[PDB]
Nucleic acid binder design. Structure first.
Ligand SMILES: [K+]
Ligand SMILES: [K+]
Ligand SMILES: [K+]
Ligand SMILES: [K+]
Ligand SMILES: [K+]
Ligand SMILES: [K+]
Ligand SMILES: [K+]
Ligand SMILES: [Mg+2]
Ligand SMILES: [Mg+2]
Ligand SMILES: [Mg+2]
Ligand SMILES: [Mg+2]
Ligand SMILES: [Mg+2]
Ligand SMILES: [Mg+2]
Ligand SMILES: [Mg+2]
Ligand SMILES: [Mg+2]
Ligand SMILES: [Mg+2]
Ligand SMILES: [Mg+2]
Ligand SMILES: [Mg+2]
Ligand SMILES: [Mg+2]
Ligand SMILES: [Mg+2]
Ligand SMILES: [Mg+2]
Ligand SMILES: [Mg+2]
Ligand SMILES: [Mg+2]
Ligand SMILES: [Mg+2]
Ligand SMILES: [Mg+2]
Ligand SMILES: [Mg+2]
Ligand SMILES: [Mg+2]
Lengths: 247, 132, 129, 343, 205, 211
RNA sequence: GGACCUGGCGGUGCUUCAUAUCCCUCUAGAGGAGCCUGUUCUGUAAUCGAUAAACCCCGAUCAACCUCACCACCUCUUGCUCAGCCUAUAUACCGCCAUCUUCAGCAAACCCUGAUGAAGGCUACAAAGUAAGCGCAAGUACCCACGUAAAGACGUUAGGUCAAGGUGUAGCCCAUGAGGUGGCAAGAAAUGGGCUACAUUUUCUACCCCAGAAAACUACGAUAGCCCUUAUGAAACUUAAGGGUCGAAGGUGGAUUUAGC
């Protein structure tokens, strides 16, 4: 761990004029910032954040209170609002740390071609314990095959068929693509959910970028993380407790 | 409050070793196992026999090297070889450490009918991880 | 706090030390714990204002006496000079008064340090020959 | 069973019963207490009942340049070894039994008056070997606590002094009686008073003061008079270096009020030089053993006044009826002027 | 929840997305560029963009579901909607050209209007005063009014007074009764309102 | 001073009730004994200020005619909002007029309150309507609109004992038929000194190939 | 006896509160019926422990013999053991835990205040607190940074366990130890928890969701009773499984009450 060096010499005289504050590094910075604000008066966001207290406590190599951190930030913001020059901009940037934002843009699967030259895309989806892999063809008549079976024969429940409709209906492409998908594990609903996600991800290769973002905002490209919760010992279920015995 | 294998906070004067300082929930997270063998793997047999043998070897070595062990034993089994790795102190004369190694290796080899080796690492004093 | 910046600069320029911030409990009476067993404490504490922001005596006045440190202090008409070794009755509020005090102490301190170097240098040159 | 046996640490932790509801609140008292004993202390590796001699473990490995062989002590030779180890065990116990006794204080069961030694050396190579520490009061204070009920702490009052005028006192507080001793004696050495002594044996003048409800009246006395004072005052006076003084304590007899009241009165005594400087006159001491010889004890450093001090025919000073009643032979007490040990 | 607070609920509405940019306000433009940076929850399997989607019927279906048996709950609802439509087609063909104009044959319009005729405007709350319980009238929020209309309809059909009659025939008969401001469920509304009027004096509490 | 406490050491401190002070405050800090007093008394001052504005015609002609009466005025400790309560009128029609004018007046009143430099920093005032049972008139608004439709087991428990169960119990039986002393804590005896006066006696070079 | 401090308590004030949470609100239940199981009481020659929250399908992830520690009878005495004891004491203890904890505090070592009294030590435009360490936190496990696990100090209830084992003190040693044979563990009842029901969102069959029948004294409803068979075992009116016979109470349950975001 980084060690603060001795703060006085052989004669016992501290090196820094703010030694006896106990926070010479923190108060030396406040003194430098306060002095700059004075000189300005005499003269006259998305990609960046303020450093956290644990990062300021390392630049200074000192221990800092929570209010000490706030006071320093309140003083820098008061310095940005002023007509700060180039010298007053390199300084503030020392305490600004770049904030990286992940892009929520959906990744588009590559468009492949089969032996006959028909363009198609392939993706995968997971719902609970069900795992689906769907092949969506660029051109088709609206046929959906699930493990080699007609979707309405594989999914006799009307709600499971509605889930297959949801991705295509949302982008107005019913009757325009052929799909051959395979699904294993889980129940009937989990399999329909896994196929819905698999078809939606593969379908993104044949729609415009704006349409892919509308599907994302419609919940059609997000893997559902809701899975069965474990039972805990000493209780009836994942959450239910045993009856609190009558007293 | 949980008690199992937990050295409790005191006044800051009690030296504990790295092993003693970690409660059971840290096993496989911060601390490893003191014995390694195949008996507890899936589809493996003779876990009961390896367990009793290990309990004995720990008691045997504690009383055969009284006041000399500076930490728990590490027991290693490869094939039929049994390796005992012990961290010991530097108080006993080296002649007595060679006697007890020769004596213990032979006695344990005839007891469990396997080649047994004892590996001693000496430390000037018990290694202290923290003062609880 | 009107003069915190001025006083910190005066200290740095003369080669001395300033404490214009919130004075923490035991900085003087518990210095070895806070700084270390070999910390050297001040030989002289100069108060440009002897009262804190709640109009009570600065804690360092009492703590300086406890540690047998002599204190110089500007004492206005509402201040208590009993424990200040060298009190100076004077206005501590007007910027002109406070600025004057800083010039005098800064100049007195700077002259005394230069005098020490002059004497030492002469004492060495004369010593060799 | 071999596998049901435990280690010595486990057995002593159980047998001693130092952790438990008995030992949490001292709910159990210990006139008879199990004492931990180290059973590996006098044990030699290699030594057993059968008396075998193992070369390299309990006997030398080589004898006469040749390796020794396995041997066994004779039945007679082994009885001696067993007997010798039993005697060594009583000798070890007898050595522990022989512990140097410490002197008692004001009474056999009292802490007051007992020496604690010099304060500990400070962090910066500071030492206080010249200072002695004496206990004045050890109290058990009981604090009622929100969750833990009545808890027991210790408040200790100790005084320190070097016997040459420098002395002080400090209170100590801790859960343990020995931590309170450390805090009190170490803190007191940083709060030392200097006490002026006349001829390095007594006070400069009679001192009568009240601190809260505790009254202390002290009288300057000649050499050989000794310390005829409250036992606590005697203890403090030995630390200051006062050899001859009379003191009478009246009102509340509170050790703390008495201690800090005594230091307040001894620190505000005017010396003869201060009186001479204050009045610019000579201070002349008249001793009956020296007859009419005038002995100048102090002379003013500044100019010497030429106008005599006014001689008020009758001084308007307040007198103590106790002092006057004694000088007139009207003080009758069976307890006054009793023969006592040298103090 | 397995969704971190950062996850926002999905907006399933085709129209909301095809709306041209020019029609958008500066506030609605900000909301749209913001969602492109937000995390979106996966759309639940219940609701889709289908044009036949009705959230009220989906809610009534869930309130009829026993032990997670949505297939059976959904079956009962679609059987009730078919039973309502057939009862109206039979009343329609048996009516005169003048009466035919007033006969509704859409089961969704009947279902919605039947529930709206059962929503209680004001409800009572049991309050304790001097060791004695007295109810107090209070206005009902929109969420609570719609819930009570459903719960009263489902509760009435589950009453044991009905002997061996299947749910699609019980519910279909009750919906058409309430659609005409008649029935037990409408009486429960009327009586709740009536009990509130009696307790107007206690409304100060 | 009075029985009302005024011993505070920082009695000369400048009272600073602003929104910025709340953010720059130690989280551990808790309100002192006389810290509530300033809040209790500052809230009362706001009540005084608002009451005068309502009854003086100069502030506003519409406000004066309304003759609004303030039931309660309590500022918040956060310093972000202020709670003011006015008494409702019987006529719901009249209630709407008062609320409408008060709602628009509040904005101007806030600036009028800023005229008092002592209370220049006044958080936005929340003119809550209460004290007049606003929810009772609201209920009547619904009551008239609402459609009412066409207009027209053991006495043992009362006794307090289960006489039946006990009667069976006895019948079933008939079927088969046919202090210490506590020591004062201060006086508990200790032997630490006796162990002390008895005595406390708990009681280099290195070479390669040594001999 | 006076004054004060702490704690406890107040049919004690004020303000803000609890998120499956104190009340209402939401869903499914318990409280009624039968059965399964625990405890209590009663009974028996016939264990023991838990037993308000924090006991009551609890020690037991388990009692036909064995297990077993119990009762009756008979037998052995340096005894499987360099003996033995499930004898007393959990108010001597280790060990392992419950509880608040669905907490966030505990605190060594110093320093300062109150006259150096018991005590107290915070104000950020800051007024005497600094603090190692422990806990929380962080981290790690599981499918994420979410959630759930795990973790959770000090202290509280002399909380539970001497019958897991070990063990201090006290007691037995031809018996309070050891072995054998047989036997006990029932219900006049009360009560806790659970199971199955009372049915039509149901019952039976096919199927695993586009069906056909049933549907009130031959319906729904026992996993109960009775009889038989089989499995395990040396041993089964006794334990379990299956078949036959039988077709009961029960018609959705007062005060009250449990769990779930
Ligand atoms: K109290
Ligand atoms: K029930
Ligand atoms: K215990
Ligand atoms: K035990
Ligand atoms: K025992
Ligand atoms: K026996
Ligand atoms: K039950
Ligand atoms: Mg469940
Ligand atoms: Mg636990
Ligand atoms: Mg001034
Ligand atoms: Mg004695
Ligand atoms: Mg029942
Ligand atoms: Mg029992
Ligand atoms: Mg019992
Ligand atoms: Mg018990
Ligand atoms: Mg209890
Ligand atoms: Mg048995
Ligand atoms: Mg026995
Ligand atoms: Mg206990
Ligand atoms: Mg996490
Ligand atoms: Mg847990
Ligand atoms: Mg944690
Ligand atoms: Mg107990
Ligand atoms: Mg038997
Ligand atoms: Mg049967
Ligand atoms: Mg058989
Ligand atoms: Mg039948």
């Amino acid at each position: 761990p980084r060690q603060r060096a001795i703060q006085w010499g052989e004669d016992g005289r501290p090196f820094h004029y703010l030694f006896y504050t106990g926070k010479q590094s923190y108060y030396s910075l406040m003194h430098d910032v306060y002095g700059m604000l004075l000189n300005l008066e005499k003269h006259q966001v998305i990609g960046s954040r303020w450093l956290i207290k644990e990062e300021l406590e390392e630049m200074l190599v000192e221990k800092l209170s929570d209010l000490d951190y706030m006071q320093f930030i309140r003083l820098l913001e008061k310095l940005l609002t002023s007509q700060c020059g180039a010298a007053e901009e390199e300084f503030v940037q020392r305490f600004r740390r770049s904030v990286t934002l992940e892009s929520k843009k959906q990744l588009i699967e590559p468009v492949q071609y089969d032996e006959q030259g028909m363009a198609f895309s392939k993706s995968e989806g997971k719902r609970k314990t069900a795992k689906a892999e769907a092949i969506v063809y660029k051109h088709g008549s609206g046929r959906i095959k699930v493990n080699g079976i007609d979707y309405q024969l594989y999914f006799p429940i009307t709600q499971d068929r509605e889930q297959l409709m949801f991705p295509f209906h949302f982008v107005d492409r019913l009757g325009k693509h052929d799909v051959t998908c395979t699904v294993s594990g889980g129940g009937r609903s989990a399999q329909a959910g896994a196929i819905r996600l698999a078809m939606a991800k593969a379908l993104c290769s044949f729609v415009t970028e704006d349409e892919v973002e509308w599907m994302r905002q419609a919940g059609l490209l997000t893997t559902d993380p809701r899975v069965r919760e474990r039972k805990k010992p000493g209780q009836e279920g994942a959450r239910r407790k045993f009856t609190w015995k009558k007293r | 409050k949980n008690r199992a294998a937990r050295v409790r906070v005191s006044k800051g004067d009690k030296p504990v070793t790295y092993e003693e300082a970690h409660a059971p929930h840290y096993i496989a997270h911060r601390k490893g196992w003191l014995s390694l063998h195949t008996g507890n793997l899936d589809g493996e047999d003779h876990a009961a026999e390896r367990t009793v043998e290990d309990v004995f070897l720990r008691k045997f070595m504690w009383g055969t090297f009284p006041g000399c062990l500076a930490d728990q034993l590490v027991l290693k089994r490869r094939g039929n070889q049994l390796e005992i790795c012990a961290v010991v102190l530097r108080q006993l004369s080296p002649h007595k450490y060679y006697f007890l190694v020769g004596y213990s290796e032979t006695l344990l080899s005839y007891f469990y009918k396997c080649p047994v080796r004892l590996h001693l690492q000496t430390v000037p004093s018990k290694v202290v991880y923290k003062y609880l | 706090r009107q003069f915190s910046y001025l006083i910190e600069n005066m200290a740095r320029d003369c080669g001395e030390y300033a404490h214009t911030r919130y004075f923490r409990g035991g900085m003087l009476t518990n210095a070895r714990l806070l700084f270390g067993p070999t910390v050297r404490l001040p030989d002289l504490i100069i108060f440009l204002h002897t009262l804190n922001n709640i109009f009570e005596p600065h804690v360092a006045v009492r703590d300086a006496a406890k540690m047998n440190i002599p204190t110089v202090g500007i004492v206005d008409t509402n201040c208590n000079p009993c424990l200040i070794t060298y009190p100076v009755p004077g206005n501590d509020d007007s910027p002109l008064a406070v600025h004057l005090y800083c010039r005098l102490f800064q100049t007195a301190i700077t002259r005394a340090k230069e005098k020490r170097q002059q004497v030492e240098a002469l004492y060495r040159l004369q010593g060799q020959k | 069973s071999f596998f049901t046996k435990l280690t010595a640490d486990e057995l002593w932790k159980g047998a001693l019963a130092e952790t438990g509801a008995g030992a949490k609140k001292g709910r159990g008292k210990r006139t008879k207490k199990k004492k931990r004993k180290d059973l590996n202390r006098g044990q030699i590796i290699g030594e057993g009942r059968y008396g075998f001699l193992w070369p390299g473990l309990n006997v030398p490995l080589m004898k006469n340049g040749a390796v020794q062989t396995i041997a066994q002590r004779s039945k007679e030779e082994q009885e001696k070894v067993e007997a010798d180890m039993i005697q060594q065990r009583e000798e070890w116990d007898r050595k522990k039994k022989m512990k140097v006794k410490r002197e008692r204080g004001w009474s056999g069961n009292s802490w007051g008056g007992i020496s604690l030694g010099p304060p500990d050396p400070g962090p910066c190579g500071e030492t206080y070997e010249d200072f002695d520490t004496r206990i004045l009061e050890v109290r058990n204070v009981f604090t009622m606590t929100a969750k833990e009920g009545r808890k027991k702490s210790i408040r200790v009052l100790v005084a320190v002094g070097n016997g040459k005028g420098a002395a002080g006192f400090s209170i100590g507080k801790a859960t343990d009686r020995m931590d309170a001793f450390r805090k009190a004696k170490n803190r007191a050495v940083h709060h030392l008073h200097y006490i002026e002594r006349y001829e390095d044996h007594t006070i400069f003048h009679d001192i009568s003061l009240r601190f809260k409800r505790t009254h202390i009246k002290m009288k300057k006395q000649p050499k050989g008079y000794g310390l005829r004072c409250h036992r606590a005052i005697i203890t403090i006076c030995r630390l200051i270096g006062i050899k001859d003084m009379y003191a009478k304590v009246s009102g509340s007899i509170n050790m703390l009020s008495l201690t800090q009241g005594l230091f307040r009165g001894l620190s505000r005594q005017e010396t003869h030089q201060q009186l001479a400087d204050k009045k610019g006159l000579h201070v002349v001491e008249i001793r009956e053993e020296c007859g009419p010889l005038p002995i100048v004890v102090a002379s003013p450093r500044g100019p010497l006044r030429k106008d005599p001090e006014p001689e008020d025919e009758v001084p308007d000073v307040k007198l103590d009826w106790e002092d006057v009643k004694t000088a007139q032979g009207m003080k009758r007490s069976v307890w006054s002027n009793l023969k006592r040990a040298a103090t | 929840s397995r969704y971190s607070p950062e996850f926002k609920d999905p907006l399933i509405d085709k129209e909301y997305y095809r709306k041209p940019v020019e029609e958008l306000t500066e506030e609605e433009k900000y909301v749209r560029e913001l969602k492109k940076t937000q995390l979106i929850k996966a759309a639940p399997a219940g609701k889709t963009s289908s044009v036949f989607e009705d959230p009220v019927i989906s809610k009534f279906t869930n309130m009829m579901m026993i032990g997670g048996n949505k297939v059976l709950a959904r079956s009962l609802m679609i059987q009730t909607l078919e039973a309502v439509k057939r009862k109206q087609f039979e009343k329609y063909h048996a009516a005169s050209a003048e009466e035919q104009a007033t006969i509704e044959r859409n089961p969704y319009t009947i279902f919605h209007q039947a529930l709206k005729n059962c929503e209680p405007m004001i409800g009572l709350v049991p309050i304790l005063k001097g060791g004695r319980f007295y109810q107090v009238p209070v206005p009902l929020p929109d969420r609570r009014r719609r819930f009570l209309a459903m719960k009263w309809m489902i509760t009435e059909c589950r009453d044991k007074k009905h002997q061996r009659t299947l749910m699609p025939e019980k519910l279909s008969h009750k919906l058409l009764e309430a659609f005409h401001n008649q029935g037990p469920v409408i009486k429960r509304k009327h009586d709740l309102h009536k009990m509130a009027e009696a307790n107007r004096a206690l409304a100060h509490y | 001073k009075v029985w009302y406490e005024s011993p505070s050491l920082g009695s000369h401190s400048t009272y600073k009730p602003s929104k910025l002070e709340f953010l720059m405050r130690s989280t551990s800090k808790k309100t002192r004994k006389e810290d509530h007093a300033r809040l209790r008394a500052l809230n009362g001052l706001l009540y005084k200020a608002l009451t005068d504005l309502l009854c003086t015609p100069e502030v506003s002609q519409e406000l004066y005619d309304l003759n609004v009466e303030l039931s309660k005025v309590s500022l918040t400790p956060d310093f972000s909002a202020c709670r003011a309560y006015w008494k409702t009128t019987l006529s719901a029609e009249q209630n709407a007029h008062m609320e409408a004018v008060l709602q628009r007046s509040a904005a101007h009143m806030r600036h009028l309150l800023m005229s008092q430099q002592t209370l220049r920093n006044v958080p936005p005032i929340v003119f809550v309507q209460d004290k007049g049972n606003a929810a009772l008139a609201e209920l009547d608004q619904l009551l008239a609109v609402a459609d009412f439709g066409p207009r027209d087991t053991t006495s043992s428990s009362l006794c307090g004992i289960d006489h039946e169960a006990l009667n069976k119990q006895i019948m079933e039986y008939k079927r088969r038929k046919d202090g210490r002393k506590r020591a004062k804590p201060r006086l508990e005896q200790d032997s630490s000194l006796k162990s002390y006066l008895s005595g406390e006696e708990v009681e280099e070079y290195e070479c390669y190939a040594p001999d």
